[PDB]
Write an enzyme that holds these catalytic residues in place. Structure first.
Site, mmCIF file in Angstrom:
data_model
loop_
_atom_site.group_PDB
_atom_site.id
_atom_site.type_symbol
_atom_site.label_atom_id
_atom_site.label_comp_id
_atom_site.label_asym_id
_atom_site.label_seq_id
_atom_site.Cartn_x
_atom_site.Cartn_y
_atom_site.Cartn_z
ATOM 1 C CB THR A 1 -7.513 -4.006 14.511
ATOM 2 O OG1 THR A 1 -6.354 -4.789 14.196
ATOM 3 C CG2 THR A 1 -7.163 -3.016 15.607
ATOM 4 C CD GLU B 1 26.985 -17.734 20.176
ATOM 5 O OE1 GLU B 1 27.406 -18.622 20.938
ATOM 6 O OE2 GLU B 1 27.264 -17.678 18.960
ATOM 7 C CD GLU C 1 -3.016 1.001 2.267
ATOM 8 O OE1 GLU C 1 -3.861 1.913 2.359
ATOM 9 O OE2 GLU C 1 -3.037 -0.028 2.969
ATOM 10 C CG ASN D 1 -0.669 -5.993 19.111
ATOM 11 O OD1 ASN D 1 -0.872 -6.711 18.136
ATOM 12 N ND2 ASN D 1 0.149 -4.951 19.072
#
Ligand SMILES: Nc1nc2c(ncn2[C@@H]2O[C@H](COP(=O)(O)OP(=O)(O)OP(=O)(O)O)[C@@H](O)[C@H]2O)c(=O)[nH]1
Ligand SMILES: Nc1nc2c(ncn2[C@@H]2O[C@H](COP(=O)(O)OP(=O)(O)OP(=O)(O)O)[C@@H](O)[C@H]2O)c(=O)[nH]1
Ligand SMILES: Nc1nc2c(ncn2[C@@H]2O[C@H](COP(=O)(O)OP(=O)(O)O)[C@@H](O)[C@H]2O)c(=O)[nH]1
Lengths: 426, 60, 170, 62, 430, 52, 411
Positions: E171, E246, E63, E198
Site C-alpha cells: 500500500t 519456553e 493519529e 500480508n
C-alpha cells in the site's frame, strides 16, 4: 482536530470555492442558512476541520475570499450558500491588476496582502493544530497569479513546517483567453517551484473534453467545471473528516508521492464520471473504478501520461470496499503496462480507503499521479515566453512597473533547469 | 543550543539513575551475605564449644 | 593529533591554576558573577544586561549559584574535547583568552597556536574567525576575540540540512 | 519558550542533587558493611585456627 | 501469570479490536465489562471494585481517528479511557518522524502508563507488542518503545508479532526504508519476534475461508485465534502445557535468529465442517504445508531448526506423538543436522470458540504451529534488492534527513542487515 | 623536510614558514616522549645492578 | 469534642459555602462537634454575605453569626488591618467568645483565608492576634491561599502575602498552603474539567477539611485528633507550612474502571502531580508525613504501602527523622454532594506532609515583592492607610530569616 483554512484568489479562485463550500456543506448537512440538520453522528464529529460553531448551531466556513474587483465578491453573496461566509473574511481591493502580473505582484500587492495576512493569521490561530493551507487560483490571470503568488511566498516564511496545497488551472495554447498568458505562467511557476509544498496542475482543455465525451453535456457553463473541480478537492481531504480502513492525510501523501523536493506538480483524475444515459447501465466495482480512473482521456490535465512514465501515483477511494481488491487492482494495472512506470522504484502506487462515499453515489475514487510527462507543458509555455521576450513585446508594463531584464532571464533559467531535471529523473 | 543542552543533561541524569539502581542491588545482596556468613560463624562457634567440652572430659 | 593536545595540557595546567586565582578578586576559590565584569573591564570589553547570568548559568551543572574550581576543570576538559558536541562555550572563551594572554592587551600570532591545537584547519579557515594575515600583525583586545568566537559558534549552529541536502546526480 | 526550556533543564540538575546525595550515603553504608565483612571473616578464621590446635593437642596427648 | 498486550499504530490497534472482542466472548464477559474461582480471565483482566473487568492493554497511535472509533464503539465501557493513547498529528509513513520528531514526546507518556500496568501485575510473564513495520507509527516509535523497554526490564520476555511489507501486495512506497531502519532495532531488542506477511493471509482466506473479497476484519480475526492459541496454556489447564518463556529457550538457537513462521489449522469453512472430520492425524499434516502459513515464503528452500506445536481441544498425547514421529521420518521436509529432535509439542483442553459473524467454523480441535527455519533469509535478501534499488540514487532520503537523520544510519543499518544475512547463511552450512 | 623547503629562512618576505615551524614543534616533542619511553623501556629486566 | 470554624473574606466564606453544605449533608451525637452551626462568616463587603442571607440556607445560620461590614478593604492589607478592621474585629471576637462558651471540650479554632486580598490578609491576621492573646493554648488551624507564581488576579498581592505571612508565623499553630494554579491543574488533569470555576475548587477543599476532622466525628480503627498534627508534624516552632494532597481525585468515568486500593493511592498522594501547592517536593527533603485514611482500610496495607515509599529513591527523606510517618484510619467512607464532580469511593487518603520545597516558594515570592518595593511602587497607598516605610523592609528581613532556616535544617 487538524484544520485547513481556505484561501480563494481572483475570479477563478472565488467561483471555484463557492461551489466547493456548497458541495462540502451538503456532505455535512448544513443548510444555506448555516444551521445543522444532519442525522448521523459521523457528520457532527468532524466539522471542526472546515467550520467554527458561532452561536446556536451557526457553522461558518473557514474560508478567505481575496481579489481586486467587486463584481466577484458580490456574485458570491448573491447566490445560495453566499450568506454563510463571515463578512470580515472578504479581504478586498478596488483598483484591479488588469492581467498585469507586476501589478498583482509589485504595485497592488503591496497594499492588500498585508490585510489578507491579518485575516489568514486570525484563521490560523483560531484553530489548534494546523494540517495545512488550501489555495485555489489560476496561472494566466493577474490578480489570481500575482496576488496569490506573493501570498504563498509570505505564508511559507511565516508557517514553514505546515503543509500547503495550490489548486491551479494553467493556460494552454488552444484555450487562450489572455494574450500575456506565457509571461504570467512562467513567472508564476518560477515562484511555485521554491514556495509551494505541492501543486496540483489543472487546465481548461481537459475540463472541456471531460464535459464533452464523458459527461456528454450540451451547455457546460462554468458551474459544471467548478462542480467537477470541487469533487476532486473534497476527495483529497475525505481522510481527515471520515474514518476508514486505510487513512491517508495530506502529509502522508506528499511524503510518499514526492521523491525529489522540486518535482511536486501533479496530474489529477476523478472516478466515477458518467453521463445520464449510462448511469444506469454501469456496475460499481473496484476494477471498473480503476480502469476509468487510470484512463488517459480522464486525466483532469491536458498532458497525456502515456507520452512518458509514471514516477509515483496515488489513489484515494471512498465507500464500503474490500482492501484486497484495492491492492490487487494496483498490482495488476502496474504489471500489464509495465513500461509506463518508472523502474528504480518498485510499487509506484500508494492507495488508501475511506468508508464514506459522496452523497448520491455508492462508491467513488480520486487519482493523484506524479508523472514525468508534465515537462511538455513547461516547454509548451517556455517557447512561447522566449518567442515573446526576444523582441521585448508587452514589456513596458513589466519593466516600467519594477521588473528588470534579469528577472525574465531568471525565469527562463529556472524553467530550463526544471525541464532538464525532469528529463534526468525520468 | 538549549534544546540540545537539555538532551545532554537528561543523558547525564539517567546515567546516574541506572547507577543508583545498581547501587541498591549491591546494598541488598551484601546484606544477604552477612546473614549466611554469620551463620557460618555460629557453626564454627558451635564446633569449638563442643570441641573444648570433650577435651576437658578426656583430661579428667 | 593527540600529541598536540596532550603536550598542550601538560604545559597549560600550571598557567590555568594562576589564571583561576587571578580571575578571583576575593582571594577565595569561588568565582562570582561580580568578578566576571571586573575581568571584562581588564580585557576592555563590556557585558550586556543578562550576559553574566547566562555565563554563570550554563557552566555550572552539579550545583546552582557561584562556580567552583572543580566545575572549572570539568568545563575546561568537556569544552576542549567538545568539538563535535554542539555544547556551550560562553565562559570557556574568557578563560582561554586570559591563559593565552601574557602581554596584558591580548595576543597576536598565538591564535595560530590556538588554531593548530584545535585542528590544522587552513589559512582560509583562519580568515574566518578573524581577518589576521600571515605577514601583518595587528593590535588585539578582549573585545575582538570573544565577539568573533561567539558569532562563529552561532554561524555553525544555524546551518542544518532540510532542503539544503544535495545528492549525487542521476 | 527559551525561559520554558531553561526551567526544564534546571529541574534535571536539581533532580541530580538528591540522587548523587543518596549515592554518597549508599557508598558509606556499603563501606561500613564490607569493613565488617573483613572483620567477621578474621574472627571466624581465628576460631578455625584455634580448632586445629585443640584437636592436635588432644590427639598428641593420647 | 499476567501478560500485557500493547498495540502500536492503526494496524496494531485494529488487530486488538478483534482480539479483545474474542477474549471477552470466551469468558462470558458482556461488552460493558461485567459478568452476568474461574480465575482464567485474570491473565488479561484485573477485577476492579466488584463485578467489573478491565483489560491489560494500551492502544497508542500518533493519529486521532483510529483510536477515537474505539472510544465511541460498542466497548466504550470495557477499556479505561486513559489506556487509549492518541497523538495530535500522524508520523505519515516517515520512520524519522516517528523515531525523532513525534515519537520523542509521545513515548514518555506511554512508558509511565506501562509502568503501573506492570505494577498491578504480580508474576509478569512478559509483554506482547503489535505493529506493522511498513508504516511510521508502528516502525518508528515501535522500535523506540522497544529500546526503552529493554533498558527498563531487559530480562522480561517481549513477544513481538510484527507484520512485514509483502513483496508484491503493498500500500505504501517508502516502506523499504521503514523496514530496514526498524529491523535494525528489531534484532537486538525483541526477544521473540514472529513475522506475519500480508499476501499469506490474503491467499489463505481466498482458498480455505473461500471469501473472495476479504477485508481487514477477517485478517484480524484469524490473528486473534493464533494469539489466543498460544495464551490458552496460561488461561486453561492442559495435559501438556508450555509457557511464554519456553520459546525463549527452545526456538532461538542463536541470539540473532528469532524470526518464526506461524501457521494455523484447521482453517475450514462452516459447510465443509460437516463433511470432513478433523482428527489429530490430518491436522498435524496440515500444519506443515506452505498453503497454510502466515508468511508468504517457501520453507522448502530451507531447513528447520526447531518447531513448536500448540494443540487445542480433545487431543491425547498418544496419537499426536505418533504423528510427530510420522512427520520426522518423511522426507518432503528436512531438519538441520545438529538438531536431532526438532519439535516441542503442547496440548491444552479448551477448544477454540467462535465469534458471531466470524468466518471460522466450530471445530473439535485445532493446531497452531510456530517454527523456525532459514527461508527467512530469503525474505531479507529480497528486501535488500528493492531497498538498495531506490537508495542508489538517494530517492526519498530528503524527507528523513530533513526530519533529523543523516547518511550514517542508512549505510550502517544497511550493512548491519547484510551482516544478518551472513549469520543465517553460516548457520545453514554444515 | 624542514631543511628542504624552497623559501629562504632568513627572509621575512614569505612568512609561511610559521606553520612549518609549528608543525616541526609537535614531532620534536613526539621525539622527546619517544625517548622517555625508551629509557623507561630498556630497564624492565636487568642482569646486574652494576652493568645497568 | 467540638471545633468551631471562622471564615474570613470573599474567599473564606465561599469556601465555607461548600464546607457547611457538605457537613449538613453528611450528618443528614456525632453531629455535636459541628451542630445551628458553629461558624461566623465575616467580611467587610456585604454583597457575598447577603448571598448567604438570601440563599437556601437562610434558616440554618443564626442571623447574628453572619457578620458583614459596610465598606471594602480595597485590596489593601493596611486598610483591612488598621482602618476598617478596627471596627469589625471587636464584634467578631465578642461572638467567638460566647460560641466557645457554649462549647465544653473545644479542640480548637480553624480559620479560612486568602492572603492575597485585603480582608483575608489584614483583619485575618488581626483576628488571629487577639485570639492568641485570649486563648493561646488552643490550636488554630490556618488554611491559607497563597498567590501562585504565574496565575494571578491582582497586582499588589506580593505586598499582602509577605505582610500577612510575617504574622502567620507566630500566630497560627498549623498552616496549610493551597494555591489556585495548582488546583486548576489538578481539576484539568485528573478531574478533566477543562473550564473550572471557583465552585469546583471550593468543593474539593471541603473534602480535604472533612477528611482530617472525620476522626473526631466518627470512631475509627486508629483515631487521630487535632492535637496530633500539632505534635507529629511540626519538628520546630518556626516550621509549620504543610503540603496537602488528596486521593483519589477521580471522575466518575475513570473511577469505576480503576481498582482503588491502599498501595496505589498512597503512591498517588506522593507524586507532585497531585498536590494542592504548585511546588516540587523532589526539590526538597521530607521531614514528616501524615496519612489520613477513610473507609475500608486495614492497618496491614497502610503499613505495607508506607514501607514501599520509604525504600523508593525518587523521593528522599531527612536524616534527622528515620520514622517519618503518622498514619490514621477511620471507618466512615467519604460522602458525596449531588452535583459534585467526584464519584463515590470505597477509601480515600489525605496526606499532610512537611518538606523544604516550601522554602523555594518563599524565595520565589520574595523576588517579585523585592522588585516592586525598591522603587517604592504602590507603597504610598498603604502608607496613607496608616502604615509607614519601616514595616515593609522589616517584613522582608523576616522572610529572609525563614529562607536561611529551611536551608540550614535540610542540611
Ligand atoms: N493485518 C492487517 N494489516 C493492516 C491492517 N490495517 C493496516 N494494515 C497494514 O498496515 C500497513 C501500513 O501501516 P498502517 O498501520 O496502516 O499505518 P501506521 O502503521 O500506523 O503508520 P501511519 O500511517 O503513519 O500512522 C499496511 O501495509 C497494511 O498492510 C489490518 O487491519 N490488518
Ligand atoms: N479557592 C478559592 N479562592 C478564591 C475564591 N475567591 C477568591 N479567591 C482568591 O482570593 C484571592 C484574592 O483575594 P480575595 O479573597 O478576593 O480578597 P478578599 O478576601 O475579598 O478581601 P477584599 O477583596 O479586600 O474584601 C485570590 O487568590 C483569589 O484566587 C474562591 O471562591 N475560592
Ligand atoms: N474553471 C473555471 N475557470 C475559469 C472561470 N472563470 C475564468 N476561468 C479561467 O481563468 C482564466 C483567466 O483568469 P482570470 O479569471 O482573469 O483570473 P483572475 O483575474 O486572476 O481572477 C481563463 O483561462 C479561464 O479558463 C470559471 O468560472 N471556472
Amino acid at each position: 482536530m487538524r484544520e485547513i483554512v481556505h484561501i480563494q484568489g481572483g475570479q477563478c479562485g472565488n467561483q471555484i470555492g463557492a461551489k466547493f463550500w456548497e458541495v462540502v456543506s451538503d456532505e455535512h448537512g448544513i443548510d444555506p442558512t448555516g444551521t445543522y440538520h444532519g442525522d448521523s453522528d459521523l457528520q457532527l464529529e468532524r466539522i471542526n476541520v472546515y467550520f467554527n460553531e458561532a452561536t446556536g448551531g451557526r457553522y461558518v466556513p473557514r474560508a478567505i475570499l481575496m481579489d481586486l474587483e467587486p463584481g466577484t465578491m458580490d456574485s458570491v453573496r448573491s447566490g445560495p450558500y453566499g450568506q454563510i461566509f463571515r463578512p470580515d473574511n472578504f479581504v478586498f481591493g478596488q483598483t484591479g491588476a488588469g492581467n498585469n502580473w507586476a501589478k498583482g505582484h509589485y504595485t497592488e500587492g503591496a497594499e492588500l496582502i498585508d490585510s489578507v495576512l491579518d485575516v489568514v493569521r486570525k484563521e490560523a490561530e483560531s484553530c489548534d493544530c494546523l494540517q495545512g493551507f488550501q489555495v485555489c487560483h489560476s496561472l494566466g490571470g493577474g490578480t489570481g497569479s500575482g496576488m496569490g503568488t506573493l501570498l504563498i511566498s509570505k505564508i511559507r516564511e511565516e508557517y514553514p513546517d505546515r503543509m500547503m496545497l495550490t489548486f491551479s488551472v494553467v493556460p494552454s495554447p488552444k484555450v487562450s483567453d489572455t494574450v500575456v498568458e506565457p509571461y504570467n505562467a512562467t513567472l508564476s511557476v518560477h515562484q511555485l517551484v521554491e514556495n509551494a509544498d505541492e501543486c496540483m496542475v489543472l487546465d481548461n482543455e481537459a475540463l472541456y473534453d471531460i464535459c464533452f465525451r464523458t459527461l456528454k453535456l450540451t451547455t457546460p457553463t462554468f458551474g459544471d467545471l467548478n462542480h467537477l473541480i470541487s469533487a476532486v478537492m473534497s476527495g483529497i481531504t475525505c481522510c481527515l473528516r471520515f474514518p476508514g480502513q486505510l487513512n491517508a492525510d495530506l502529509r502522508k501523501l506528499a511524503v510518499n508521492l514526492i521523491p525529489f523536493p522540486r518535482l511536486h506538480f501533479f496530474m489529477v483524475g476523478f472516478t466515477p464520471l458518467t453521463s445520464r444515459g449510462s448511469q444506469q447501465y454501469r456496475a460499481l466495482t473496484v476494477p471498473e473504478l480503476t480502469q476509468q480512473m487510470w484512463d488517459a482521456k480522464n486525466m483532469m490535465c491536458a498532458a497525456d501520461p502515456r507520452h512518458g512514465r509514471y514516477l509515483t501515483a496515488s489513489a484515494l477511494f471512498r465507500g464500503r470496499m474490500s482492501t484486497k481488491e484495492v491492492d490487487e487492482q494496483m498490482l495488476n494495472v502496474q504489471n500489464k503496462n509495465s513500461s509506463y512506470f518508472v523502474e528504480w522504484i518498485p510499487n509506484n502506487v500508494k492507495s488508501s480507503v475511506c468508508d464514506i462515499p459522496p452523497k448520491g453515489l455508492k462508491m467513488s475514487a480520486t487519482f493523484i499521479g506524479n508523472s514525468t510527462a508534465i515537462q511538455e507543458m513547461f516547454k509548451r509555455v517556455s517557447e512561447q515566453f522566449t518567442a515573446m521576450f526576444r523582441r521585448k513585446a508587452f514589456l513596458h508594463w513589466y519593466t516600467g512597473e519594477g521588473m528588470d531584464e534579469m528577472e525574465f532571464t531568471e525565469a527562463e533559467s529556472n524553467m530550463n533547469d526544471l525541464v532538464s531535471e525532469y528529463q534526468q529523473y525520468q | 543550543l538549549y534544546y540540545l543542552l537539555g538532551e545532554r543533561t537528561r543523558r547525564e541524569h539517567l546515567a546516574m539513575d541506572m547507577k543508583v539502581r545498581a547501587s541498591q542491588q549491591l546494598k541488598k545482596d551484601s546484606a544477604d551475605d552477612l546473614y549466611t556468613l554469620t551463620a557460618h560463624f555460629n557453626e564454627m562457634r558451635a564446633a569449638k564449644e563442643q570441641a573444648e567440652r570433650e577435651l576437658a572430659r578426656m583430661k579428667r | 593529533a593527540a600529541a598536540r593536545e596532550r603536550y598542550a595540557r601538560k604545559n597549560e595546567q600550571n598557567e590555568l591554576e594562576r589564571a583561576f586565582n587571578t580571575i578571583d578578586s576575593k582571594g577565595d576559590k569561588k568565582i562570582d558573577a561580580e568578578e566576571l565584569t571586573e575581568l571584562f573591564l581588564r580585557l576592555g570589553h563590556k557585558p550586556k544586561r543578562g550576559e553574566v547570568e547566562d555565563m554563570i548559568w550554563e557552566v555550572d551543572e552539579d550545583c546552582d549559584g557561584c562556580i567552583s574550581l572543580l566545575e572549572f576543570q570539568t568545563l575546561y576538559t568537556r569544552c576542549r574535547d567538545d568539538k563535535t558536541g554542539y555544547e556551550p562555550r560562553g565562559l570557556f572563551n574568557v578563560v582561554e583568552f586570559v591563559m593565552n594572554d601574557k602581554n596584558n592587551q591580548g595576543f597576536i600570532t598565538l591564535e595560530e597556536a590556538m588554531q593548530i591545537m584545535y585542528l590544522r584547519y587552513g589559512r582560509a579557515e583562519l580568515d574566518m574567525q578573524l581577518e589576521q594575515v600571515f605577514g601583518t600583525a595587528d593590535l588585539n583586545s578582549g573585545k575582538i576575540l570573544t565577539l568573533t568566537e561567539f558569532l562563529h559558534c552561532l554561524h555553525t549552529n544555524q546551518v542544518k540540512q532540510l532542503l539544503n541536502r544535495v545528492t549525487a546526480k542521476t | 519558550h527559551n525561559k520554558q526550556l531553561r526551567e526544564s533543564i534546571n529541574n534535571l540538575r536539581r533532580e541530580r542533587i538528591m540522587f548523587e546525595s543518596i549515592q554518597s550515603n549508599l557508598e558509606r553504608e556499603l563501606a561500613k558493611l564490607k569493613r565488617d565483612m573483613a572483620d567477621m571473616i578474621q574472627q571466624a578464621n581465628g576460631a578455625f585456627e584455634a580448632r586445629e590446635k585443640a584437636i592436635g593437642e588432644m590427639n598428641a596427648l593420647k | 501469570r499476567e501478560v500485557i498486550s500493547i498495540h502500536i499504530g492503526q494496524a496494531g490497534i485494529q488487530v486488538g479490536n478483534a482480539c479483545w472482542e474474542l477474549y471477552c466472548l470466551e469468558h462470558g464477559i458482556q461488552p460493558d465489562g461485567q459478568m452476568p474461582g474461574d480465575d482464567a480471565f485474570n491473565t488479561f483482566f484485573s477485577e476492579t471494585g466488584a463485578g467489573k473487568h478491565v483489560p491489560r492493554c494500551i492502544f497508542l497511535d500518533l493519529e486521532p481517528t483510529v483510536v477515537d472509533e474505539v472510544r465511541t464503539g460498542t466497548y466504550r465501557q470495557l477499556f479505561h479511557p486513559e489506556q487509549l493513547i492518541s497523538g495530535k498529528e500522524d508520523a505519515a509513513n516517515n520512520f524519522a518522524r516517528g523515531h525523532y520528531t513525534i515519537g520523542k514526546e509521545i513515548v514518555d507518556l506511554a512508558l509511565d502508563r506501562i509502568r503501573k500496568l506492570a505494577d498491578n501485575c504480580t508474576g509478569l510473564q512478559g509483554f506482547l507488542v503489535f505493529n506493522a513495520v511498513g508504516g511510521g507509527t508502528g516502525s518508528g516509535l515501535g522500535s523506540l518503545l522497544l529500546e526503552r523497554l529493554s533498558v527498563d526490564y531487559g530480562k522480561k520476555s517481549k513477544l513481538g508479532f510484527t507484520v512485514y511489507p509483502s513483496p508484491q501486495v503493498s500500500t505504501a512506497v517508502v516502506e523499504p526504508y521503514n523496514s530496514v531502519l526498524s529491523t535494525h532495532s528489531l534484532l537486538e531488542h525483541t526477544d521473540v519476534a514472529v513475522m506475519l506477511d500480508n499476501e499469506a493471509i490474503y491467499d489463505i482466506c481466498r482458498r480455505s475461508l473461500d471469501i473472495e473479497r476479504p477485508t481487514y476484519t477477517n485478517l484480524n480475526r484469524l490473528i486473534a485465534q493464533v494469539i489466543s492459541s498460544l495464551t490458552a496454556s496460561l488461561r486453561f489447564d492442559g495435559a501438556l502445557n508450555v509457557d511464554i518463556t519456553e520459546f525463549q529457550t527452545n526456538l532461538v538457537p542463536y541470539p540473532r535468529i528469532h524470526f518464526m513462521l506461524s501457521s494455523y489449522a484447521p482453517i475450514i469453512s462452516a459447510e465443509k465442517a460437516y463433511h470432513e472430520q478433523l482428527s489429530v492425524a490430518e491436522i498435524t499434516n496440515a500444519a506443515f504445508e506452505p498453503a497454510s502459513m502466515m508468511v508468504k515464503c517457501d520453507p522448502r528452500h530451507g531447513k528447520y531448526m526447531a518447531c513448536c506445536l500448540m494443540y487445542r481441544g480433545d487431543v491425547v498425547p498418544k496419537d499426536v506423538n505418533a504423528s510427530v514421529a510420522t512427520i520426522k521420518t518423511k522426507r518432503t521436509i528436512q531438519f538441520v543436522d545438529w538438531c536431532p529432535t526438532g519439535f516441542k509439542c503442547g496440548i491444552n483442553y479448551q477448544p477454540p470458540t467462535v465469534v458471531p459473524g466470524g468466518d471460522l467454523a466450530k471445530v473439535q480441535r485445532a493446531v497452531c504451529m510456530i517454527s523456525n527455519s532459514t527461508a527467512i533469509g530469503e525474505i531479507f535478501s529480497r528486501l535488500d534488492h528493492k531497498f538498495d534499488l531506490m537508495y542508489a540514487k538517494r530517492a526519498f532520503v530528503h524527507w528523513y534527513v530533513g526530519e533529523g537523520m543523516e547518511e550514517g544510519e542508512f549505510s550502517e543499518a544497511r550493512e548491519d542487515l547484510a551482516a544478518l544475512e551472513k549469520d543465517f547463511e553460516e548457520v545453514g552450512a554444515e | 623536510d624542514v631543511k628542504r623547503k624552497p623559501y629562504d629562512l632568513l627572509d621575512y618576505s614569505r612568512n609561511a614558514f610559521d606553520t612549518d615551524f609549528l608543525e616541526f614543534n609537535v614531532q620534536i616533542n613526539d621525539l622527546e616522549l619517544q625517548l622517555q619511553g625508551f629509557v623507561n623501556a630498556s630497564f624492565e629486566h636487568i642482569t646486574s645492578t652494576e652493568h645497568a
